[model samples]
Target chain A: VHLTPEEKSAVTALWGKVNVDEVGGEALGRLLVVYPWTQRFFESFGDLSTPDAVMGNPKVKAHGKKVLGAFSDGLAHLDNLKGTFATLSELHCDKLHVDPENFRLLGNVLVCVLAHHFGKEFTPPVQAAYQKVVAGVANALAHKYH
Target chain B: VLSPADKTNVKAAWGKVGAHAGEYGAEALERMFLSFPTTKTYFPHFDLSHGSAQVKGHGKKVADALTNAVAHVDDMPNALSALSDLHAHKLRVDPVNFKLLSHCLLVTLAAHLPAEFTPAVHASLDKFLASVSTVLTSKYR
Candidate 1:
């Protein structure tokens, strides 16, 4: 789905909160392990309607509840992505999570699908904001340990 | 977030990854085979030594090729398309087991990288790794 300006703003704001630890935590990491393909499924759901189509797609259908299970499980985790960023921002003074390095990875994935299905213009500055967050996070990671 | 120079550095680092892959690719295959021993059942006609070399060669080749590929375009269908093929073939060996191995790899990377693999890194890698399974599904049919 095309993200509205407001949605874009929310995503942009949300980008800064991203923390790899949040995703890698025991609970979330297990979720990732169980459904390694779910990220695309969830992102495909960003628009929501396409997910519905999957309900009947032969490929998805044949997968049994594996795909569906991943979808339901992923939907449950969206709040984690948002919540993690929020808490991290409060703790870290800089929007270290919001920069580019992290976001660029996501943007590359999303842009591939969106450009193919919609158009090039479908991606927004949210991608840029995400990249910035990742860059900050990567630097933070390098400094914190290395 | 990445300056043009930062992009250059990251790409350069990736090239180094390829260089390392060339040296260690064979080791990686043996490791993979040892970890996923059942995979050998899928290739009835395959020679173990030749298979090991092929796997190792593909690792470095693909790694270097992808580094160049990503540098050239922000989005790449060709790469994904190729992944669709290779992963599909591997699924003949068993997609589920491959995924299990992938999860293991991510966990291993996270542990080794330590601080660099922050929440953001986890989240991104979660997404990154998930994409692998998606292609597998696409490949199956």
Candidate 2:
């Protein structure tokens, strides 16, 4: 996505001082709170060395599915909704209960973009399309919320 | 494109890998690393085929650490930066090596999942690889 001159300048400035870790802090905190028992859940699996171990470990498998499902659900919901970026910003803001940070939104955009670029195991095309969806959402969030 | 059902399937598949690891061992993840010998070159004393007992033990430890890390993935720039700093200063591996690994992982995935391989997956992998490469390459600042 080509940034407008103003967008480019804003992004460049934000990118210059950005810390990747800090950008997603609050959102991650929310995820942790929401999934408090994830550790115990994952550990209940006896041994994960063989494919069978993973298949057999009900808890580990369940938790992994939960998290991935949550992420996928969130993304899928975003894709279906209108004003996608605004929705994310509003949701993020609501979830974190913090004021919006335009730069963080930008980081989210770039991160999603990069994630899609790297392609996942079997879902390459869907992952790639997410880049466009995320980019569109980011632009909308920046324009509306930023 | 991945529909809701596909996302569910994807997650289910990942769960299977996790379950398999718990039941059988970390052999799957170990094989993932071993698939690219260079990745193994970086870690010392890392074994993949611990089977159920060892892998389950290790998987618990890993899950604990990973859960903590995942919880903080948002504020991980400092840790990430520290890694970048190490790669830039201490680690002697070439940035190009990371790029190679990214490609290598992609190829490995393709070999393992030829039927499911698609252009979209490649694009996402490329983005992830590039981001990782950039982090590895940017050491001085």
Candidate 3:
């Protein structure tokens, strides 16, 4: 979870360029399709009968943005990440019952989305930097279980 | 750890559930599989087909266990002690399954007993399930 100042620059700069609302659905939508097992957590979303349907659902898009939004929030509040993620830790671990493993998976998918959208800009160094960012997020979300 | 009001609420709620616990519990397991298929890994031997008799029977036992918790609230650690050893050492369930099943069961009860599963009742049952999960997984250490 350690990122140098330059690494932080890469995450902040690259994040500012892409529309998270668009990338958000791309990442989560792909996550649900690629990993069908993840659909279990979205049973309440109500209509995921097919791959296209899962990707196209407005609920998925809105929910996707909500999750993706957390990245920026995380970026803003790196100083107290553990405290920042406390409520989400309870929601994920207690209310939704999502496995902590799922957070890393989502993070991986979002990273993939960055590469797909950014091409040359999502360089090796940038990815390495982003990796640390997401690792922190995954742990924060999984905090309550500890 | 329930407040006095919580105890009264859970007791009254389960009392409303009386004889239909098996039916309700069975439906809860079915819902879990329907929505949270990831949980089904633990039930490889279960028929697992929706509404299958096998799942129904298993859920009845699952439901029956919660009833036992109601009576043993004061002694859950020792009361559930033997099962904890067996569950961890033999059955080897991951703690995740208990949380998933507990969520499904809460959803199931809410669907069936809407008015009775008020916010307070939901909170009590929620804490009870939390305690149950803790005791069941305690033996893993």
The prediction achieving the highest lDDT against the true structure is 3
What TM-score against the true fold does each predicted structure earn?
0.36, 0.29, 0.54
For all candidates in order, the CA lDDT equals 0.39, 0.40, 0.82
By lDDT, the better pick of 1 and 2 is: 2
**lDDT tens digits, residue span B1-141, model 3:** 777887777778877877898898898888878877767766788898766999878878878888888878778887777777766544555566778888998998898889988888999999888888878866433
Query: DockQ winner among the candidates?
Result: 3
Evaluation by lDDT, superior candidate among 2 and 3: 3
Q: For residues A57-84, write the lDDT of model 3, one tens digit per residue.
A: 9989999999888877887877777899
Model 2 spans with C-alpha error above 4 angstroms: A1-146, B1-40, B47-79, B111-116
What order do candidates take by TM-score, descending?
Answer: 3, 1, 2
lDDT of 2 by residue, A37-79 (tens): 3223234355544333433455543553443333333344543
The local distance difference test score of model 1 is 0.39
Q: Candidate 3: lDDT of B82?
A: 78
Q: Which ten residues in a row have the lowest lDDT in candidate 2 chain A?
A: A26-35
Candidate 3: the clashing residue pairs are none
